[PDB]
Design a binder for this molecule. Structure first.
Ligand SMILES: *[C@@H]1O[C@H](CO)[C@@H](O[C@@H]2O[C@H](CO)[C@@H](O[C@@H]3O[C@H](CO)[C@@H](O)[C@H](O)[C@@H]3O)[C@H](O)[C@H]2NC(C)=O)[C@H](O)[C@H]1NC(C)=O
Ligand SMILES: *[C@@H]1O[C@H](CO)[C@@H](O)[C@H](O)[C@H]1NC(C)=O
Ligand SMILES: *[C@@H]1O[C@H](CO)[C@@H](O)[C@H](O)[C@H]1NC(C)=O
Lengths: 231, 132, 231, 118
């Protein structure tokens, strides 16, 4: 076949919640997968591991490496320069990876249940929409009260790019179904979104039934000649 | 009139809400919202003395009264993380319509003492400005 | 590589709107050259025409064949067996595909924009949601008044399954951003959903302003000489 | 006799007025239209025929007719009508309830009450 080289970014779930930002370098398209070479430019804890040469499309071997490290040199803007100088070719090839600039930060919105789900008194739906972020990585969790729900109780879609108003931005969604009775009892729910362009790395919105679109509005304007202190 | 959402004392505005489980059609019910504005008829525009005449126009944006920008604490996995709570708090800078019972408001006036002048400091709300 | 043959159900856009019911028995991965022939079990009155092979992974080919039976005996309950024949591993492969049973209807919700987006005079965003439908085949279109908008103006995700109690069901979302002057003038919008288990095959929802407008407003101007507020 | 739809009174070109007659035992009934108190020529409106209405137990019949008139005349306040004529009526009389015309309430209260807040 044909050899190629790749370098992927560290995953967002272990960069934000933890800090262990391991890297990865992958060459695919070899059938003598013992003679290979990996070299990064910084190596102080230089024990870069290698794994079992797993298969590929139609049973071709594939080698890969992991250089461990944590998140202070990544977020400060360093560079990493993995290279393959294997003897299964007579010329080496190179790649690199850097934290993406030109970022934007998302806008988080929680939407109340629709009006015609509340008649049946069975289960109601809460939608979470996060829009306009320039990298393609995001985290979405849910909380009830102050207790995190387990991940097998909601469904999250993937992140896709939206119709271009000049620059390329992305979007993502998520829904959650809860009981119709305890939404009316007065429980509160939250959608929490994490992305690497936010200043405190996280943001949260909290919704409940009392903080919603009202049916009746009472307005009283009182005119106070007496004082201007507002007790 | 049951649960307080907003109690703002720079503008002196208060918003409450209550689910009124009404009598007729006993499987549906309304959501009521009460807003109370107290308007001062003798305050200035800036809170100093000679600024501009008395304020005659008062504007209230409910998207600004319900705003929440102080960081909070959230226990996600077995961790404490800090998050924000709003999309719009790119920044005090707000104009206040009334005073507040728990804060001093002072001024500076030059007066003469035979020779030179001084920078005499004057309390505008005398109850809240004792050094204690 | 290894030889394998699968066949696919016709497309939903051609089965609901158009008239192009085409089943496609195809095998990819052929040690020999283009020398294959296919026979089908019905003989409705059309010849299963073929196309030339294609380019695939490192020497493998991909032959195909389309059954032109666009008269729809598919939704009456046929069975439509295919059969392969090629100078290959000498055991002729067969495969069987039919219409699914145990169908359910989708439930369509169209949500109003968030108020925070409304109080900024820019583009406002709408959300469509369908959930609870049994096969993962669906079509989502948008409308403004009566004009169908072209499909480069909106983003729609894939169709994934949702966590539930036994009976597997699926869900899908979509969004569309419009201008605030068109919303504030009073122009309406619509989300339209096509599925096979709907009896008239389509559903509509419509939204504009005055959707969740309140029913009662009380204004009280309390004059001077009556200021009686409480802490 | 029904008020026009709202969306036809947003382009301000033409409006439609629909006269529905329902639930009568013999299947023969006239419909005539009149502007103010003067009638119209019958080539200016469309009227259907009668059909057997679905009903439990006993049979009825229904008929329908419409009229497209200028939007600014209805915005002015000119009156339209409908004359349904029949053999099983006292004198085959009309019904004229359409014109161009929220609930507001204004109160003044002394309220020197016992003791309350605001
Ligand atoms: C509302 O009124 C207050 C009170 O007058 C204004 O604050 C004051 O503004 C003046 C002029 O900008 C400041 O004076 C400055 O003093 C420093 C020395 O501390 C000197 O370096 C400057 O040249 C100038 O003389 C004053 O410090 C300041 N603050 C007070 C009195 O606490 C305020 O700006 C007004 N706001 C609006 C929105 O009109
Ligand atoms: C990173 O790679 C790019 C092309 O892949 C090339 O500019 C160079 O090899 C590296 N950049 C720098 C600044 O070293
Ligand atoms: C239909 O498919 C099943 C599953 O492979 C198979 O056992 C059966 O023989 C097929 N029937 C026909 C008529 O092709």
């Amino acid at each position: 076949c044909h050899p190629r080289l790749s370098l992927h970014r560290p995953a967002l779930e272990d960069l934000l919640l933890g800090s262990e930002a391991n890297l990865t370098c992958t060459l695919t398209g070899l059938r003598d997968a013992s003679g290979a070479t990996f070299t990064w430019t910084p190596s102080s804890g230089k024990s870069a591991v290698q794994g079992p040469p797993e298969r590929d499309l139609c049973g071709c071997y594939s080698v890969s490496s992991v250089l461990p490290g944590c998140a202070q040199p990544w977020n400060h803007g360093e560079t990493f320069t993995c290279t393959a100088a294997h003897p299964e070719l007579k010329t080496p090839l190179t790649a690199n990876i850097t934290k993406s600039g030109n970022t934007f930060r998302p806008e988080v919105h929680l939407l109340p249940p629709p009006s015609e789900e509340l008649a049946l008194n069975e289960l109601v739906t809460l939608t979470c929409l996060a829009r306009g972020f320039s990298p393609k990585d995001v985290l979405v969790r849910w909380l009830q009260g102050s207790q995190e729900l387990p991940r097998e109780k909601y469904l999250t879609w993937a992140s896709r790019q939206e119709p271009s108003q000049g620059t390329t931005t992305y979007a993502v969604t998520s829904i959650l179904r809860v009981a119709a009775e305890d939404w009316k009892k007065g429980e509160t729910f939250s959608c929490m979104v994490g992305h690497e362009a936010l200043p405190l790395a996280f943001t949260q919105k909290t919704i409940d039934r009392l903080a919603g679109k009202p049916t009746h509005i009472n307005v009283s304007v009182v005119m106070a000649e007496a004082d201007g202190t507002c007790y | 009139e049951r649960i307080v959402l907003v109690d703002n004392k720079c503008k002196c505005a208060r918003i409450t809400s209550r689910i009124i489980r009404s009598s007729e059609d006993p499987n549906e019910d309304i959501v009521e919202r009460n807003i109370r504005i107290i308007v001062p008829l003798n305050n200035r525009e800036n809170i100093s003395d000679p600024t501009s005449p008395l304020r005659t126009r008062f504007v209230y944006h409910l998207s600004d009264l319900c705003k929440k920008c102080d960081p909070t604490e959230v226990e996600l996995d077995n961790q404490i993380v800090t998050a924000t709570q709003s999309n719009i708090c790119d920044e005090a800078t707000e104009t206040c319509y009334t005073y507040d019972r728990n804060k001093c408001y002072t001024a500076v006036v030059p007066l003469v003492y035979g020779g030179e002048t001084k920078m005499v400091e004057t309390a505008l709300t005398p109850d809240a400005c004792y050094p204690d």
